[PDB]
Design a protein around this ligand. Structure first.
Ligand SMILES: CC(=O)Nc1ccc([C@@H](O)c2ccccc2F)cc1
Length: 171
């Protein structure tokens, strides 16, 4: 049975408790915490690619008001479908299962300017999603998982000072 487990879930939950925020910039910013998963139940002999995208969570944006996140207006039109291919792709099932798979190099941006970055809209909430795509498959089988503990609001600058301090504490 294929299982994709979130690593450092307790750490992600510390951020989610406060409402997590990830900075987006013109040139792109890596995430903290880094999305990392453990994988079991692939065919060790088969080859697969791992991909990452970000799903919009709401039909509205958010705003930080009097120290609380609240519905903050109408949403902007959806960000373009950006997909990040894990740089180890394609690789054997045995490779992906021998140690956690880490998406440490992905960068989030608010400006489409190449570099394999992910475009997000500031003040909107997103949920990371990991896809496993089997290589050489005429049926193009793909298996997707979402990670609820990793939801975050994209921001140009941190709003909650507790988030600013958590990012410094754990990173
Ligand atoms: C059966 C079927 O729809 N297969 C399929 C679909 C999409 C892809 C990727 O292009 C892909 C595109 C966007 C996001 C993640 C992805 F993995 C690969 C295989």
């Amino acid at each position: 049975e294929l299982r994709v487990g979130l690593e450092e879930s307790e750490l992600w939950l510390r951020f989610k408790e406060l409402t997590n925020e990830m900075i987006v910039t013109k040139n792109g910013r890596r995430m903290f915490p880094v999305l990392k998963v453990n994988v079991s139940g692939l065919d060790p002999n088969a080859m697969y690619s791992f991909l990452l995208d970000f799903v919009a969570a709401d039909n509205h944006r958010w705003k930080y008001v009097n120290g609380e996140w609240v519905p903050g207006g109408k949403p902007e039109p959806q960000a373009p479908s950006c997909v990040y291919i894990h740089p180890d792709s394609p690789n054997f099932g045995a490779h992906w299962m021998k140690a956690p798979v880490s998406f440490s190099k992905v960068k989030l941006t608010n400006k489409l300017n190449g570099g394999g970055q992910i475009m997000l809209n500031s003040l909107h909430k997103y949920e990371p999603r990991i896809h496993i795509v089997r290589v050489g498959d005429p049926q193009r089988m793909i298996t997707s998982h979402c990670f609820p503990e990793t939801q975050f609001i994209a921001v140009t600058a941190y709003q909650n000072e507790e988030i600013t301090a958590l990012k410094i504490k754990y990173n």
